[PDB]
Amino acid sequence: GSHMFMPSDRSTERCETVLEGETISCFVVGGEKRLCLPQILNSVLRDFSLQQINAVCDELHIYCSRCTADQLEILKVMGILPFSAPSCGLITKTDAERLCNALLYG
Numbered sequence: 001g002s003h004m005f006m007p008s009d010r011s012t013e014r015c016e017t018v019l020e021g022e023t024i025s026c027f028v029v030g031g032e033k034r035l036c037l038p039q040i041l042n043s044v045l046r047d048f049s050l051q052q053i054n055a056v057c058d059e060l061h062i063y064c065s066r067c068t069a070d071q072l073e074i075l076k077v078m079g080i081l082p083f084s085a086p087s088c089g090l091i092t093k094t095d096a097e098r099l100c101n102a103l104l105y106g
Contacts, residue, residue, distance in 0.1 A: 010068060010070045011027045011029070011068060011070050011071045011074065012070070013027075013074070014026065014027055014074050014075070014078060015027070015028060015033065017033050017035065017093055019035065019040060019044055019093075019096055019097065019100060020044045020100050020104060021044070022039075022040075022043045022044050024036060024039050024040060024043075024096075025039060025075060025078060025080050026090075026093070027071050027074070027090070029065075029090075032092050032093060032094065033092070033093040034065065034090040034091070034092055034093075035090060035091050035092070035093060035096050036075060036080055036081070036088060036090065037064055037088065037089035037090060037091050038081065038085075038088055038089070039080060040091070040096060040100075041053065044100055044104075045099075045100065045103060048103055052103070053099070053103070056099060056102050056103060057095075057099060060095065060098055060099060060102065062091060062095040062098075062099060063095075064089040064090065064091050065089065065090045065091075066087060066088070066089060066090070067087065067088040067089070067090060071088070071090070072085065072087065072088055075088060
């Protein structure tokens with residue numbers, strides 16, 4: 001058992017937010033919505049190269065976190081990711097908005 005060692009709460013539900021016209025699934029962590037990165041890359045930023053996206057993320061000091069086992073499962077149950085997805089990155093709402101703004105406009 002891990003509970004006796006005082007583990008932190010895990011994600012138990014998902015939510016969503018609208019990013020540049022697309023509804024993206026998220027998990028609230030630390031008071032901020034964390035957006036499913038693959039979903040963004042496959043929709044709002046579908047026509048941008050991963051090289052450019054990555055380059056701009058670095059310039060904006062955007063850190064992409066990794067889905068916990070619980071978050072990965074929830075996204076799969078929601079049909080957002082295939083059941084065979086090995087992992088999934090997350091990006092904060094603020095970071096995602098700035099990234100899309102930098103790429104889509106100006």
